[PDB]
From Swiss-Prot, chain A:
It comes from Homo sapiens (Human). Phosphorylated by AMPK. Highly expressed in embryonic stem cells (ESCs). Expression decreases as ESCs differentiate. Component of the 26S proteasome, a multiprotein complex involved in the ATP-dependent degradation of ubiquitinated proteins. This complex plays a key role in the maintenance of protein homeostasis by removing misfolded or damaged proteins, which could impair cellular functions, and by removing proteins whose functions are no longer required. Therefore, the proteasome participates in numerous cellular processes, including cell cycle progression, apoptosis, or DNA damage repair. In the complex, PSMD11 is required for proteasome assembly. Induction: By FOXO4; expression in embryonic stem cells (ESCs) is mediated by FOXO4. Component of the 19S proteasome regulatory particle complex. The 26S proteasome consists of a 20S core particle (CP) and two 19S regulatory subunits (RP). The regulatory particle is made of a lid composed of 9 subunits including PSMD11, a base containing 6 ATPases and few additional components. The gene is PSMD11. Belongs to the proteasome subunit S9 family. This is 26S proteasome non-ATPase regulatory subunit 11.
Swiss-Prot record, chain B:
Keywords: Acetylation, Isopeptide bond, Proteasome, Ubl conjugation. It comes from Homo sapiens. Component of the 19S proteasome regulatory particle complex. The 26S proteasome consists of a 20S core particle (CP) and two 19S regulatory subunits (RP). The regulatory particle is made of a lid composed of 9 subunits including PSMD7, a base containing 6 ATPases and few additional components. Within the complex, PSMD7 interacts with subunit PSMD4 through their respective MPN domain. Interacts with TRIM5. SMART domains: JAB_MPN (SM00232). The gene is PSMD7. GO terms for cellular component: cytosol; extracellular exosome; extracellular region; ficolin-1-rich granule lumen; membrane; nucleoplasm; nucleus; proteasome complex. CDD domains: MPN_RPN7_8. Disulfide bonds: none annotated. GO terms for molecular function: protein homodimerization activity. Residues 5-140 form the MPN domain. Component of the 26S proteasome, a multiprotein complex involved in the ATP-dependent degradation of ubiquitinated proteins. This complex plays a key role in the maintenance of protein homeostasis by removing misfolded or damaged proteins, which could impair cellular functions, and by removing proteins whose functions are no longer required. Therefore, the proteasome participates in numerous cellular processes, including cell cycle progression, apoptosis, or DNA damage repair. This is 26S proteasome non-ATPase regulatory subunit 7.
From Swiss-Prot, chain D:
Component of the 26S proteasome, a multiprotein complex involved in the ATP-dependent degradation of ubiquitinated proteins. This complex plays a key role in the maintenance of protein homeostasis by removing misfolded or damaged proteins, which could impair cellular functions, and by removing proteins whose functions are no longer required. Therefore, the proteasome participates in numerous cellular processes, including cell cycle progression, apoptosis, or DNA damage repair. This is 26S proteasome non-ATPase regulatory subunit 13. The chain holds residues 283 to 376 of 376 of the full protein. Belongs to the proteasome subunit S11 family. The gene is PSMD13. It comes from Homo sapiens (Human). The lineage of its organism: Eukaryota, Metazoa, Chordata, Craniata, Vertebrata. The modification N6-acetyllysine is found at K16. Coiled coil: none annotated. Component of the 19S proteasome regulatory particle complex. The 26S proteasome consists of a 20S core particle (CP) and two 19S regulatory subunits (RP). The regulatory particle is made of a lid composed of 9 subunits including PSMD13, a base containing 6 ATPases and few additional components.
Curated annotation (Swiss-Prot), chain E:
Keywords: Acetylation, Intellectual disability, Isopeptide bond, Proteasome, Ubl conjugation. Belongs to the proteasome subunit p55 family. The modification N6-acetyllysine is found at K64. It is linked to Stankiewicz-Isidor syndrome: A neurodevelopmental disorder characterized by delayed psychomotor development, intellectual disability, behavioral disorders, mild dysmorphism, ophthalmologic anomalies, feeding difficulties, deafness, and variable congenital malformations of the cardiac and/or urogenital systems. GO terms for cellular component: cytoplasm; cytosol; extracellular exosome; extracellular region; ficolin-1-rich granule lumen; membrane; nucleoplasm; proteasome accessory complex. It comes from Homo sapiens (Human). This is 26S proteasome non-ATPase regulatory subunit 12. The keyword Lipid biosynthesis does not apply. It comes from the Eukaryota. Component of the 26S proteasome, a multiprotein complex involved in the ATP-dependent degradation of ubiquitinated proteins. This complex plays a key role in the maintenance of protein homeostasis by removing misfolded or damaged proteins, which could impair cellular functions, and by removing proteins whose functions are no longer required. Therefore, the proteasome participates in numerous cellular processes, including cell cycle progression, apoptosis, or DNA damage repair. The gene is PSMD12. GO terms for biological process: proteasome-mediated ubiquitin-dependent protein catabolic process. Residues 1-116 form the PCI domain.
Amino acid sequence: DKKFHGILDQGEGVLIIFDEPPVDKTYEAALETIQNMSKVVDSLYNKAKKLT
Amino acid sequence: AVQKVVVHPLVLLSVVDHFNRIGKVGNQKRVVGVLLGSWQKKVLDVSNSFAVPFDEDDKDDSVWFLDHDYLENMYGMFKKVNARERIVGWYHTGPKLHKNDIAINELMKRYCPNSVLVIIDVKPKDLGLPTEAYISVEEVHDDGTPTSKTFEHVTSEIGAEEAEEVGVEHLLRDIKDTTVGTLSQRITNQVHGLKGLNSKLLDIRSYLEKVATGKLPINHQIIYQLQDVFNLLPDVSLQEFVKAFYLKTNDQMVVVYLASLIRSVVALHNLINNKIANRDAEKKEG
Amino acid sequence: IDAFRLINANMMVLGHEPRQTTSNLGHLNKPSIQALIHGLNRHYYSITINYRKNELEQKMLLNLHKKSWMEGLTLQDYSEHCKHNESVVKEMLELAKNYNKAVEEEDKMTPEQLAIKNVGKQDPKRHLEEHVDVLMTSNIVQCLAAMLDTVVFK
Amino acid sequence: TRPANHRQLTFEEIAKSAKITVNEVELLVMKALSVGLVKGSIDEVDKRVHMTWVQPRVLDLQQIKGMKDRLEFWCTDVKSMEMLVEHQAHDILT
Amino acid sequence: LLKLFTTMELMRWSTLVEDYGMELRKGSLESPATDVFGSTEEGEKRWKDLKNRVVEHNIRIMAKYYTRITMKRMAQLLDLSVDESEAFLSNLVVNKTIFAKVDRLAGIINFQRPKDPNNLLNDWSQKLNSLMSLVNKTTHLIAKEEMIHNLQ
């Protein structure tokens, strides 16, 4: 339930605690611009197809 | 402490005219004048300057002249025409400072309590930043100096004002310049940077070759203060620093890879928009 | 800047300059309409101004906007530099959202009428060239200065 | 003595050259850190005592001889690597 | 009393009592320390608080001068059990006046902080900017000054 940043081990009986990285933001916004650039080439693709 | 000064570009030019007044002697005649500034803050301002007569010999550098009477009347004129302005210090034009240059300060500390000098350079053979300024303190040493009195380095920069940026940059039109060019100044800046690095190393080994062998005082100045410079010298390519270039440079590579991916599509719009406008203006003309 | 030279009124019929060259006749302008309304060429005559330069001040008037090697070898800070890249790309996504609509749109309007319905709030293709230039020159110099601080140092 | 290459020295050479026992070298080096002639750190899972900063001392002729050899080997590499920037870009930077 | 001030002068509470066993009871003025320790209910609070302040004293310089420290060495340099060591580091990290990390399947704990390549590359450039270029500017000017004193 994300109350806690941890992980457990059955073969060890051991609770392990790690921290949280705020890093994954540049790559997330990177690929969404590629989704927008997919459509503007499609908007140019029929533009050349409708007339050379 | 003062911790920087701000020099307007009206001076650095109102010095060089006075070097051009008496410059017919050619060989050597140092220009000394009076500096005018603002009792501003911890940070200090420099606005105006004027000259004063001064001569000095080659041997026995203790025979020198500052006309006090000329310094009283002409500053009395500038106090008369300008009440905002008062004295802050002095300047001299010598490329490297001389041995005489401390008694001149010891004269005019009775005018301003912190009288500050500015060394300028009429001939910066160094292509780097000229016109550096000093201030005198006492640093009485373990050796038993009764008064260890030597000037201290103070950083400095060229000031700016709205009227003088008009007149200066009008006169910059006699040569070409790229201030508007992005990354063309930048590549020169590491060229102008590392040229400064090589210049300071050729100077320091010339001092270090002399003090090694034959002749120089070997004193407990720089030779271990410069040993501390070697102590830093980061060990760049080692265990965990490799994971600083391969986790952070490739971050900045993706943003460049994003920026190219749009710039190519933008230039591809200009193809079809030109190729439609080319042949359809042709096929209706014919 | 401007400089003038008084002429007599007693010689208003007789010539005042012998005019043996072209240098003060058609050069640097024809006289302006708001200055000839009082002056030129009644009661005085204008005069030309140039700029003589000694070599000594010319050499130092050239170089007063440069710095030491400290400014040439900075690495700004990687937290804000990544934050600035995180900032600029984020609205650059939104510029691409608006860019899909307008380029696809293209009402057949004889594009000077496209060029009158764009003054307003309309801005595709203009910020899109702009932010790419900012993301380029920031990232290249931040990399390349970090390149030299390992090759040169140790 | 060692030129900052593996200056993370372990306890044994401290305990040998100072000829104090093993369980007292930590109280020994924390004294020198407290006075402030050194600015290192102490590990205990390996018991290696890393060194960062040494105070500057007096030296002599042959220390200057190696120091110019450090300086010349550093000076001529900066100039060579600065040529490689300008040689790469001649008429590109104006 | 100045011995407790800076860097522990490495101290011990048992050596403290052997040096201070008579400032409680003997002396010529004697009156604050009996108010500190001699009265029973006020002393017993101030006995254990003096215990609290000396163990708070040592953990601070341990965080200064240890990359890591084992579990056994901390218990013998505080002269108390490994259980009571865990209680002292617990109520000072929920105070978060000393950050720590008691990895106890091995006993090896650390006093350092997990770093970032945003932080590690920053500290590399920080030594590179402040103390490789500015001190390089410094040494050249004093080297200019030695010409003036010496030739001629």
